[PDB]
């Protein structure tokens with residue numbers, strides 16, 4: 001039987017144009033002052049169906065509600081929330097449904113406050129953010145690729161990363177060369193700032209790095225030119241380093257990660273970034289992790305959106321030419337990548353998670369942006385063992 005689908009704006013709506021002219025909060029749409037602003041609400045339907053749309057809203061205004069080219073003009077004239085009819089739409093196929101809101105006239109300060117989109121008489125199952133963190137829900141599902149290492153002990157992992165222009169999205173972490181105890185990648189942080197980040201967790205489990213015993217603190221061994229070193233907390237704790245570097249979409253950068261136990265019960269982690277635009281390797285940092293005796297484990301990559309406001313945009317990244325070097329000095333081309341998604345995806349509140357093969361023998365990750373094809377947890381992807389073995393001046397790297 002058809003059912004009512006109540007879609008909360010706080011977990012499913014975004015200001016998608018003129019960001020300063022409306023806001024999504026725990027209340028839904030508030031501070032909606034600019035007629036140029038567009039608010040978009042997304043929910044997924046499993047089968048074709050009609051839907052009678054209403055808004056749970058209040059205000060003194062005229063707004064425009066749209067589903068593709070079909071638009072409805074809607075007056076709000078109330079001080080308190082009421083269920084305001086919009087009109088019927090026909091969803092002709094499964095997938096994400098995007099409903100847009102735009103201000104047309106405001107009798108006072110703003111276009112009104114919108115708490116929910118209500119879709120009545122809907123046939124079939126739906127997915128969207130409900131009974132789930134709006135914050136994490138809107139940030140969307142992070143995705144991961146894990147690469148299989150050969151047998152034996154790997155000391156270095158090498159991976160080539162390219163963020164295509166279509167995948168370049170502010171407030172994203174493109175994590176290239178992770179390992180069992182931390183991360184190495186690049187971020188697009190603001191219009192004037194992009195960072196190469198390298199983080200290593202302490203073995204001591206705490207949310208405050210100052211609560212880590214001295215003999216378990218991550219120690220700085222080497223620091224690259226212009227690199228900033230500090231400590232982090234609130235997601236476990238440890239040491240981090242970054243280099244401000246204006247990386248460009250469409251360019252291929254190289255991440256070279258060294259993990260080497262010292263034989264004295266510590267392991268050293270040394271991160272090198274190839275600044276393609278300058279054609280030179282940079283040292284980010286070398287950190288020592290105490291109470292740890294490991295070679296390289298769990299080489300992996302991930303794609304993450306930091307900003308709930310950016311959830312409506314996709315982001316994407318390509319990873320190519322994965323190599324591992326054994327402690328004995330032997331290079332092997334890696335071929336096997338396993339795709340996983342985060343718990344937001346597992347909750348099925350966001351279905352816009354994807355990864356796999358490119359047509360040019362790379363792997364990709366893609367999330368956000370409310371696209372319609374997902375990929376199951378644990379799906380294995382493969383590449384041909386082609387590509388140029390890395391030619392690294394090891395001595396020169398040691399002088400950085």
Ligand SMILES: [Cl-]
Pocket residue numbers: 108109110111112
């Ligand atoms: Cl108002």
